[PDB]
Each structure stands twice: as C-alpha cells, then as structure tokens.
Amino acid sequence: MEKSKPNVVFVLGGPGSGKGTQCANIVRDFGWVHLSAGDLLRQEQQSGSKDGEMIATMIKNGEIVPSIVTVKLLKNAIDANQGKNFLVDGFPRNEENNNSWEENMKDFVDTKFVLFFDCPEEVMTQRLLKRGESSGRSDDNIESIKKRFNTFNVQTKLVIDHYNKFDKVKIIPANRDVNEVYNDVENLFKSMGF
Numbered sequence: 001m002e003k004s005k006p007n008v009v010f011v012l013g014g015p016g017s018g019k020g021t022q023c024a025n026i027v028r029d030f031g032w033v034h035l036s037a038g039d040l041l042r043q044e045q046q047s048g049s050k051d052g053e054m055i056a057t058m059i060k061n062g063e064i065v066p067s068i069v070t071v072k073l074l075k076n077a078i079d080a081n082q083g084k085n086f087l088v089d090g091f092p093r094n095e096e097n098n099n100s101w102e103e104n105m106k107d108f109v110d111t112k113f114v115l116f117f118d119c120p121e122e123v124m125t126q127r128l129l130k131r132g133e134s135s136g137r138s139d140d141n142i143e144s145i146k147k148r149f150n151t152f153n154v155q156t157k158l159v160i161d162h163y164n165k166f167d168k169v170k171i172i173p174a175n176r177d178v179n180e181v182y183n184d185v186e187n188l189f190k191s192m193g194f
C-alpha cells in the first residue's frame, strides 16, 4: 500500500547471443519493460548531445561507455515507469557499470538475478554479420565484432562470475532455435513467480 520498488533482471550474454530477441518475448508475455542499454545509448547519440560522438566512437570500437551516461539513461527510464518491472539488457558489462548501479539504484530496486544466454562465439559472429545486412548498426562488422568479443571476455565475464558467486545467475543455452530458447525463458520466469 506503500508502492513496491521494481524487480530488475539483468540480461547478459555475448554480442548477438539473443538478449534483445528474448527480451521482446518476455515483454509480450509478462509485461515487463525492456531497457536495452545499447539501444538507450544509440538513442542518446542520435539526438544530439554532449556525449553523442563519444558514444559513437566507443560503440564502433566495442568499448564500454562511462557509467554516468549509461546509468543516468537507465535511471530516467525506470523513474518514468512507476509500478513496472524491468529487463535491464546488456548491463552491467563491467565492474564500473555494476558499482555505478549499486551506488545509484540499490535502495530503489530489487535486482533479482542475472539471466545469462550462453552462446559460442562462432555462432554469435554469424548472427551479427547477418544482422548487419539490415541493422544499420556501426558495430555489426567483422572489425567491431571481434573487439566486442574481447570486451565481453575481459570485462563482462568477471561481472557474471561475481554474481554467480552469490548464486544469482540463471544460465540458458542459446545455441538453438529461438522458440526452443524462449520455451526455457518463459518456464524460468513462471518458476520465479513472474
């Protein structure tokens, strides 16, 4: 009767592991709000800030943008959507992301688990090249893609391992057809009481 603070699920995975694809299904069936940090950042550069050409340069190189930009974008959207729960997609991608979250957000959300989509690099590469045929994204090319893998491997995997220490990671294998992946996703969110 006091208002419940939002539930948050972090959705992580390599580049092109299918986070956005599966998050759209969850929005559809469960009515959570999907916040893709990458989308939000592409939005922020596309009208036409301050930070816009930094974001462009870092995205093209597969680098993680300074967390004050990204966490502000997440927090604004969350604050605009009282009484919803949130799929925070592609964040946190390093320890700075995670610390800046805890600093800003921690008393105001119940962050529940990390949903991790596990996929082979070689499969991700093929998806991302295919996507790049029509996505118009500056990072869907062989150069950027391999830079994105290194950033994932070096920075992001440590974050997932950190959450896994506290038993807060749910792993779904993502090297199958999208409906087979989603069947498991839908079953998980049902089992978690959502």
Ligand SMILES: Nc1ncnc2c1ncn2[C@@H]1O[C@H](COP(=O)(O)OP(=O)(O)O)[C@@H](O)[C@H]1O
Pocket (backbone or CB within 6 Å): 013, 014, 015, 016, 017, 018, 019, 020, 021, 022, 127, 128, 130, 131, 174, 175, 176, 177, 178, 179, 181
């Ligand atoms: N299970 C899957 N099998 C094959 N293609 C997939 C699968 N999941 C997503 N895709 C495709 O791979 C690409 C990357 O998926 P996307 O969800 O955008 O990735 P990300 O994890 O970067 O958000 C898209 O073109 C998407 O349609």
Ligand SMILES: Nc1ccn([C@@H]2O[C@H](COP(=O)(O)O)[C@@H](O)[C@H]2O)c(=O)n1
Pocket (backbone or CB within 6 Å): 015, 016, 036, 037, 038, 039, 041, 058, 059, 060, 061, 062, 063, 064, 065, 066, 070, 089, 090, 091, 092, 093, 097, 139, 148
């Ligand atoms: N937490 C995040 C999420 C995305 N990004 C940037 O946006 C790019 C695209 O991310 P997505 O694949 O999640 O859309 C990343 O490779 C990275 O350069 C970021 O800097 N910080």
Ligand code: ALF
Pocket (backbone or CB within 6 Å): 014, 015, 016, 017, 019, 020, 038, 090
């Ligand atoms: F999360 Al992506 F390409 F959109 F890695």
Ligand SMILES: [Mg+2]
Pocket (backbone or CB within 6 Å): 019, 020, 036, 038, 090
């Ligand atoms: Mg995405």
